[PDB]
Structures are given as structure tokens and as C-alpha cells.
Amino acid sequence: KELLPPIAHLYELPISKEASGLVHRTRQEISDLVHGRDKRLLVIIGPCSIHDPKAALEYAERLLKLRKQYENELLIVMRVYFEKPRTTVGWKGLINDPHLDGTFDINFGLRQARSLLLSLNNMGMPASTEFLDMITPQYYADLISWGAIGARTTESQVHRELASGLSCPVGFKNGTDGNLKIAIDAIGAASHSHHALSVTKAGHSAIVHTGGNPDCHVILRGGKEPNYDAEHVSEAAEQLRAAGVTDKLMIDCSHANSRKDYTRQMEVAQDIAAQLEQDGGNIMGVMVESHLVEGRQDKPEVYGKSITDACIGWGATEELLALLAGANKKRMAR
Amino acid sequence: KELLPPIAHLYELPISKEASGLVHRTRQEISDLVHGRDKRLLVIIGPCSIHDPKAALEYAERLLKLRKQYENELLIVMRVYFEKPRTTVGWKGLINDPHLDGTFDINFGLRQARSLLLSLNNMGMPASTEFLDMITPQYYADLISWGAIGARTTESQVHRELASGLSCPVGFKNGTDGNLKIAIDAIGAASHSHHALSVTKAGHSAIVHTGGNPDCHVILRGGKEPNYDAEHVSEAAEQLRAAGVTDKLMIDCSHANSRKDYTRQMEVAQDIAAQLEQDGGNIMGVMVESHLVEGRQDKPEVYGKSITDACIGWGATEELLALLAGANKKRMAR
Amino acid sequence: ELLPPIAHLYELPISKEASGLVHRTRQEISDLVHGRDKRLLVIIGPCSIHDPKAALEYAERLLKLRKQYENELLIVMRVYFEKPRTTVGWKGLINDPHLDGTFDINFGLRQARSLLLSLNNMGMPASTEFLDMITPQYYADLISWGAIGARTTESQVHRELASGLSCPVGFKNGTDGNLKIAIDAIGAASHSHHALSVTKAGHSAIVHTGGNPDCHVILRGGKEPNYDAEHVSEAAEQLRAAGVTDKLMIDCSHANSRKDYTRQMEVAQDIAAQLEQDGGNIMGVMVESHLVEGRQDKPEVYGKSITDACIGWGATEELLALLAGANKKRMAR
Amino acid sequence: ELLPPIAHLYELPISKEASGLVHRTRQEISDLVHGRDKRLLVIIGPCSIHDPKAALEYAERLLKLRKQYENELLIVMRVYFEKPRWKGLINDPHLDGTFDINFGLRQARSLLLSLNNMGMPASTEFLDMITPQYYADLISWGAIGARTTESQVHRELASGLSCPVGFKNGTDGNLKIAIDAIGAASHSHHALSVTKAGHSAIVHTGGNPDCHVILRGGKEPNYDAEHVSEAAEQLRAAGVTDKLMIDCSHANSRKDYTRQMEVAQDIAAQLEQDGGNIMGVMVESHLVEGRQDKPEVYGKSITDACIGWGATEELLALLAGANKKRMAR
Ligand SMILES: [Mn+2]
Ligand SMILES: [Mn+2]
Ligand SMILES: [Mn+2]
Ligand SMILES: [Mn+2]
Incomplete structure (x- = not known):
């Protein structure tokens, strides 16, 4: 099959006025979190991966009510990830293998x-x-x-350059190692201008002079050990100030920080709520793996149940969001 | 100014009949080493980075003599790297900044x-x-x-796919942590076939189905701790066997194993040489950073002197190659 | 920004049934060009397409005649998107669809x-x-x-294009009355060429065409009209002397009709008589036809040309029954 | 695999001096088309280029005559790679x-x-x-x-070119097609083309205001005073430049190279008598006269027969002398 260029898809599915309005302001609103101008809490929440658009839309319908309800405390954004990267061997995601x-x-x-x-x-x-x-x-x-x-x-040069050319905020994860330095460097690199090679909307390779991306930050997602608690947050903030980049960061409640157990996501969020209640001035966001139904499955048999990493279900998702809004309500009052 | 597609370069500089046979043959020769069919030592040696074609060619002329001289013991190949990745500081290499x-x-x-x-x-x-x-x-x-x-x-899915469609053998480095698993996973992924996006010789994005690369292997390059000795090699080999991949590997004499001191490449070579004399069954090659003149310089003033990592000079290079040829002749005669 | 063909082919892939109709009809026409079959090819429909709704209603009506007369005529609809105009005027449905x-x-x-x-x-x-x-x-x-x-028809690059097409192609005599250019063009279109063209992916490239063996001539007047037997017989002699197919198409409209849509029927009558007598050199005709007769400068009335004037459906029924009847007798000898 | 223009522009970029010469010559020919200069444009050289060595040798000689006659004639070399029919030098360079x-x-x-x-x-x-x-x-x-000249896509093409362009009457002898072609190429167009990078694209051309007609025979040879006055009328009637070019080879010579001089003579006399509407002539000329089927002789055509150098010297002197008088009045 011949690969269609972006323009093909952009012609059939142009961005709407409303959609570009929301992307523009959400980008703007998140920039404000990255640079400490707003104290609301970014929440990136949704399925580990999207395998069914119908389930995804229903998920979004529920999530939206809660994004509106908690809008003064939290800035809720849906995980719409198409794949789970592979160490090896499962399914490569919706884009690569949509059927x-x-x-x-x-x-x-x-x-x-x-x-x-x-x-x-x-x-x-x-x-x-x-x-x-x-x-x-x-x-x-x-x-x-x-x-x-x-x-x-996060350590890949071309990915750092990719980021320097995007118009949205970008979060960089610590290494599968637990290594924070690669993410801090990545911020450095993505904020600068580069002469990269990319491909145009028309499907041709080209030189692009990127403008730098001034709204990047770090994501704590565990390593050898979990890095979500106050002491890991404090150390990270220090390292961030020493490189002279933003010391506002995100924490992933899932993956290595929950130690590959979905039921621990809540526990990590509880720890984060407590940091927000005491102080937590260095946290601008969190990440949660959430779906309509908890756990995971190898084959897409059940509706709204992950086929990559296991997620918490809708019920626990409600509790978890209520927990963080409340704790963040208090931080924003001081 | 606009980016030329590969076909423009291929039309000015088509591959000659001699170069293509040299390439076909050397790739096959290295495949024999990777899979233990031949016991010559692959030696990847030459400047940390090429910043001058003239110095590069003169280096090669001398190196050519030794390649012929030691052709029964060592398979010698020139290092022709156009950069050292650098996290935000300095010269982007000869491809990006040729002037x-x-x-x-x-x-x-x-x-x-x-x-x-x-x-x-x-x-x-x-x-x-x-x-x-x-x-x-x-x-x-x-x-x-x-x-x-x-x-x-090494961990990047997109570079693993890249390797899966290359027709030369490929080596993957243990991680900046000392970590070997990620290199072994990489061999896994790069040996399989992939459906990926790439860009054709004509400069257009396209779907490619890669055939998989059978001749991948590990490179030991230190972590926090240098990993060139018997014990590390032994331990590396085991992991490789347990993953069902080639237990023949390569060892970097430079960088972390040298403790980033160019005067210690010889030390590591000595250690490798004693392994070859004794047994050294699992070693299939070495990497060495070497130039006409030893050391490094910030600016390209001196002819044939690295402007990236420090390198051993030509004299020491002759001594090192002679030491490896002699040790490997012994391994080959058992 | 121009989209490559593959973009349109992804949204509108050719269906199996369309695929089979195209294949079948190109072969069927091929047999007319080379005289293996004596049905009369009729290219018929509007001068230009300005409304898909009318074109569809027209096709529906035509399809029924296509079947009624399927043993005498091979009816194919005319789906031209413009009349080339040497002055200011609408550039057609591809350039100016709105x-x-x-x-x-x-x-x-x-x-x-x-x-x-x-x-x-x-x-x-x-x-x-x-x-x-x-x-x-x-x-x-x-x-x-x-x-x-x-x-x-004289343009080398258009001749190279025909050589690459997988459908039969017709080449017109020159506004001069000139037949040599169409004969030369068949000449050229039948040969393999190494031309430059644009791929399905939107890129320029070298293509080696295989030759198009199913080309033929179209008589479309002078100067003086050239549909009658005397002109027909003359065209055939030259075609033979050139060693190309001596089966030709005649355009009932345009200059052969003296630029008058009410005269297409008269050209058809004359062709009918030729078919009744002999007319062994005719393999097709061309007719400008719409739902409603005539023309208009703006697209005010439904199914009425805004380019050249066409006959209406009433006259269309008449013209086709005439050629079917007359060709029925040709085929029975 | 077809390389795109950018690959050839990267290897062979236009020099400072070539840019200057092109811009200046377009601007000077433009002056002839619109009646600000009364020199005679001479488009002259081989029928087709099949050897660059020969072509450079010929140019070297033509240059000397371009200087010699710079106040009377504006000589520009004819560098045509083919003759519509060997498929030419670009198709079949070898x-x-x-x-x-x-x-x-x-x-x-x-x-x-x-x-x-x-x-x-x-x-x-x-x-x-x-x-x-x-x-x-x-x-x-x-x-x-x-x-x-009748092809819509070739008119659009000329619409986007930055050089003047001449359009021939048809193999007819039909002038109206070259007249409607000026109209069309003078207008702006939304046409499909291919970029310097090799992709098809929409290009909005700006119009080419320096086009004109080339008289090149019928029918009956169409180079004389009467045929010229007839073309001028129609050109004025059509509201376009009544300043035109006349081809001395091909139809107007009855496909005879020896007759090229004859046409040039008629033209010279018009230039002396009046000849106000003639801005250019075309001539087919090589180092050696005649033609050949195989390229065995250096400097000799393998498409249309051309005049040799000796006759080129005479034909040019004749046109310069005649035009000096026109420009004198
Ligand atoms: Mn996940
Ligand atoms: Mn180095
Ligand atoms: Mn018409
Ligand atoms: Mn010629």
C-alpha cells in the first residue's frame, strides 16, 4: 500500500474552529502550569492504550463531566495513546495495527x-x-x-528535536533506569532551536528549522524504585533548579511507580494528595491509567477493558479524581 | 535551501563494482564472526569523529597496510563516525556542520x-x-x-526497526547504566521483520516491510563500572545464551571502559589480549578510538587530531593492533 | 495544496463491478476498432457535465436504451468536464466545480x-x-x-499519453479538415515511448508505455462537413495506405452539424443510409445530448447544457432508434 | 529514476553573470516586442543540438558577430535539443x-x-x-x-515563464491560433505543474506580457510584405502586439536550406522600404551546411539541413545593413 501523506487526512478531517480553539487554550493553560502561573493540577488520565474508538468516546463522555466539575482544581486531559511501546512482542497499537x-x-x-x-x-x-x-x-x-x-x-536526539518543533507542552520521562538527568537534559535540548530533518505534510523529507519548545517538563515514573514521594520530588526539583529549567513536574501513578499493579495507583495518588495538602509546590500534574473497566485482557473480548497495561476502572477513577481535586482545592487556597 | 533526496547523491556518486564487492564480502565476513563460524577478531578502529576527509584518508592508507598485514588474525574496519552526540554543547558533526x-x-x-x-x-x-x-x-x-x-x-523502537532493515551487521550497546538487557531486547526486535515508516531514495515517506537483521550483537561499553574483563564477559555471555541470541560480543576499549582516558585503551586491549591467549571464546571484536595524532583539541587547528574524544596516536595504534594480532593468532591455533 | 491521485483512490476505490464494466467495454470497443464486431459504438451525452445530479438522471435514462439496443449499438456515455474555450468562459467542472x-x-x-x-x-x-x-x-x-x-492531436506529449492509456482512444481530424495529423497520431500512440509523467503518488517520473493498439480516427468536419460516404471512403483509403485501422468514428455534432444542434439528426440519417447500403468503415458515432434540448449561458434550467447546444431527450430517443434500426440491417448481412 | 530539478540546480547553479545576461536579454527582447527598441532579434543556430563541442564552437563564432552587430541586430543562439518526429539530445543524449x-x-x-x-x-x-x-x-x-500553439496546457506553461515567448501559426498556416495563444498566455492561470522538487502542484501563474507571433509558412509561404500587413491587421484587430517574427527556414524556405537567404532578402527589402512590424527572424545555421542521417561530420545537422557558416556571415551582414537604415529613419 502507498502511504498517504498528512494532507490527505487533513483534507477529509480538517480541524474545526471549536477544536482548534480548545487545543490553543488548553496548550496555553498547561503552559501556565509548567511555569507556575496557575496552581491547578494537570491530570493526564485514560486508557493505557486505545483499541476501541467507541469505548474511548463513552470514556470521554464520563471523563468530561468530571473535567467540568473539577475545572477550578484540576485540568483534566484524556490519554489517547495509540500503543504501548514494546520491550517486545504484543500488539503495536491502533495506528500500526487497527484491526x-x-x-x-x-x-x-x-x-x-x-x-x-x-x-x-x-x-x-x-x-x-x-x-x-x-x-x-x-x-x-x-x-x-x-x-x-x-x-x-527521552534520550534520543531526534525525539528531542521532534519536541522542539511541537506546539504543545511536552513531558519527558525519567529513564527506565530511574535516571532523571536524561529528562532534564531533554528539556534543555527541546527548548533550543534545531535544524532537523523531518517530513512535510505533503510526504517529502525536508529540513525544518524548529523554534524551540519553551513548555517542557519532567515526568517521574519510577525506576529501580518508585520516585513519587516528597523526598524524590524534592531532589528532582533541586536538580531541575541547578540546570536552570522549570521545577514543576508530573508524577505518573502507574507503570514503575505503581510497580505494575493497577491497584496501587490509588495509593500513589493518596501520597500525592498528602504532598499537595502539606506543600507540594513542585507538582504541576499527574498521570493515571484508567478505563471503564479495571484490569486487562489479552484479547479485546470485554468492552472498555485494556489490552495493554492494566487500568483502574471507572468507579476507582471517580474516587481518585475526587481525592485529588479536594487536596488541590486546599493548596490553591494558601 | 531545499533537501536533496538520496537519488541525487547516488547519481553523482554511484557505488563502484569494487566498493560493492568489498561491502558484500566484508558484511559476510563479519556475519561469520557474529555467529562463530570464523575466529578472526573484528576491529573497529579510527577517529572518534571525522571532521576532515584529508586526514581521514591518510589515516586509512596507513590503516590499510595493517589490515592486509593482520588479515589472518584480525578483520580490520575503519571507524567513520560523523559525530559524538553532545547534550546541547558544541559542534553537531560533519553531516550537520560540514564547514x-x-x-x-x-x-x-x-x-x-x-x-x-x-x-x-x-x-x-x-x-x-x-x-x-x-x-x-x-x-x-x-x-x-x-x-x-x-x-x-538502544531502547528506541524506531532505531530497532531501522536496524531490522539494514543489510550490514549491527551492534547495540549496553545502557548508560551498565545494563545489558536493553541491548539483548534490541537484538530481539531487530532480528524480526517490521512494518514501519521510512523514506525512500526518492525522498518520500513510505511503508517498509523489513526482512529482519540476523547479524546483530552486543557491545560492552562500561556503565558505572567498566565491563571488559573475563568475569563481565562470562556473565554477559550467559545472559545472551539464556535469551537464545548470539553469545559472541564486542568490547569497547574506549570511553567508560577506558574511564574516558585515551591513555588506557591499551590497558583494556591488554586485558582483552590475555583473555584471547587463555580462552576468550565469546569475544568477536573490539572498538578503538585512534587518529594520526594522540589527544584532542577544542578547535580544528592541528591536522589529524580529534576535536571530539581524545584518541590514541598512530604509534600507539600500531602497538595495539600488533598486540591483538599476536594474541588472536594464538586463540586461532588452539 | 494538490492531493495526489492515491488520496482520491483511497476514498473512492474502484469497485469490482466498475472494474468489470470497464474491462469488458474496452475489449468490446477494441473489437469494433479492429472489425471483429460490427455493433456501432455511440458516444452520447452532454457537451459538458455541470451538474452530477442531471448527469445521473441522464445516465439512468440512457442505460435503458443501452440495453434495448445492446445487439445493434454499444452505448457509452459522454462525460466531458469542459469545452475547451479559446476565450473567457467557465473552465469546466474539474477546474471550477462550484x-x-x-x-x-x-x-x-x-x-x-x-x-x-x-x-x-x-x-x-x-x-x-x-x-x-x-x-x-x-x-x-x-x-x-x-x-x-x-x-x-498534433501535440507529441498528448500522443505519448495515449500510448500509455489502457482504453481505446480517438483522435480528431484538424480544424483544417486535416486527416493526416490523426493518422500520424495513431501512428505515434501505437508505439512504446519513454516519457515523463506524474505517478499515482504525485511525483514526476520516467514511464515506459507499452503502446496503445486500439486507437482510431474521428471525423469532425472542416471547413466543410465530412460525415458522408464520399468523405468516409476517402478517409479509409488513407488509413489503409498508412497501415492503420480503417474503422472510424464520426461526430454528428459540432462542425459536422454546422454548429447547429437541430442538424445532428440529419447527420445520423445520412449515417443510417450509409449503414443500410454498406458503411463497413464506420465503427462509431458521437452525439451531444441532454435531458432538455438547447443551451443556456447560466445553469438556470435543470438538465440543459451551458456549453454547446444539445439535442433533448425526445430527439435522443429518435436518433438512437434510427441507428439501431439501420445497424440491425448492416449486422444481418 | 527521474531526478528533480533541484538536483541539477545544486550541481549547476546559475552564475552571477548568466543571471545578468538572461535578465538583460529578456528585458531587451521585451523592448522589441513593445516597440522601445528597433533592433532585429535574430534567433539563429542549429536545427538541433546533438554535440555540445560543436555548439560551443558555433557559439564562439556567433558571439563575435553578436558584438559586431549589437547596434542593429540582437543575436541569440538557437539551442533546441530536438525536432518533433532520433528523439533529440535530452531524450536520447547518447x-x-x-x-x-x-x-x-x-x-x-x-x-x-x-x-x-x-x-x-x-x-x-x-x-x-x-x-x-x-x-x-x-x-x-x-x-x-x-x-x-493550440494546446491549452502549453499556453498556461508560457503564462508562467519569465522570458518572452513566440507562438507559431499552425501547420495549417493558421494565424488565429497563435493570436488566441498570446491572449491566453498574457492572462493569469491556475494550472497544474511540477515543482523544482518533483511534485505535482497548483501554481498560480502571473501572466506573460511579452508574447508574440512567429510566421512560418502554410499552405503558402507567408513571409512577404503583403502577408505581414495581413498579420499586423489581425493582431491590432485582436488588441495584441502587432510586432512579429518571421522564420526563414522550414515552410517559408519550402524546406530548402539554400532558400533561407532568399527569405532574408525579402525581409531586408521590407526593412529598407518600411518593414515597421517585423521585430525578429529565425534562421537554421550550423558550422557546415546540409545535413546527414548519422553524425559523422562535425558541425553538420542530423535533423533539418542548415546553412553553413560562410552563408551565415552573408545572411547576417545583409540583415544588419538593412536594419541600420530602418533604425536611421
Ligand atoms: Mn501503560
Ligand atoms: Mn568517541
Ligand atoms: Mn460540444
Ligand atoms: Mn528545424
């Missing part, structure tokens, strides 16, 4: 991804994703209010 | 890199390089007999 | 492919004029017979 | 039927650049929608063939 049958139908996957994101934004839910790849971003980055670079790629 | 003046001139830079490579293979010197991104390899991979993926991108 | 002087080529190519896919799906093959080297890729797969413009 | 277009475009661009750099401006016929951008930048004057 979940090992066919590669990238053209269909990118169309479906663009469509899901346009629809979420159109209903009022801004969206987040991880940019793995140097070529796919162009397809839907205009519908993204916040991007991640993963633990496995 | 060494801080400008960016990638059309000139890719042209000059291909020229050099074409001239090295025509004189009878095979070449090795590090593939950093997904776009530039297409400009000269046909001239490369062995490649490396940088420690910084 | 009919407001806008240029919106993406929308226009998409709409053209869609109409053409809809027509093949309903069971009506389609013909068109290929006017340039770039747009045909977007829908050539949906076309059973093509024409090269009278203005481009 | 003259062996192997179609190495990449080599042929490169060699085409190289020769053009050398010619400009030696002080010799250059003209060619744009046949094709895709090739022009590989070297339009080195051309001071373009032609559209009689066989494409």
Missing part, C-alpha cells in the same frame, strides 16, 4: 486516529498522546494539547 | 560523507558508522560494512 | 471521480477527453473510451 | 536509442550555462510541461511549436 489482527493498515489506522481525536476535541475533551515516531505526528499533532516522550526515547 | 563554522549545510554534508565513504571502499578500506536517525542512512548505507546503534537510542 | 470562477481542483477531481464511479456502478460505461498529463491518473481507471482534443 | 533523460537534462543545463557564461544568450522550444524548470532560468527566449 487487531496483525495486518498492518497504517493508512486506516492514521485515519481512525485522526477521527477519534477530532471527535474528542469536538465534544470538549482535549487529548494527549505519546509521540513515538518522527513521521506520524504530522497526521494529528494539531489535535493534541499535551505530548509525552517515553522513557525509552 | 566547522556553526552553520548547517546538510546537502553539502551528506555529499561529503558519501564521497569519503566511496573513496575509502575504493582504496580497499571497509567502513563502519553509527546510524543516528531514520532519514540520513539512505544516503550512504550501501557503503557501510558494520553499523552501530548509539547507547542513547 | 460554477463561480473559483478554482478548487481537489474538490473538482474528487467530484469527477465520484460521478464516474457512480456511473460505472449503475452499469453505464463512461468516456472522456484527456486534456493534460496530470489529471487522467485521478480517474482513467474508470474510463472505457477516451478522446484527445482537436487542439492537441 | 544518440543510440537508450533514453537517458537524467544525463540529457544535465548535459542540457550544462551547455546552456556555459553559453550564457561566455556572453551568448540562448533560446529553445518548450515542448513539455515537466522539463522547462530544469533550465528555464538560462533561457532568454522561448518558442511553442506549431504543433502545440
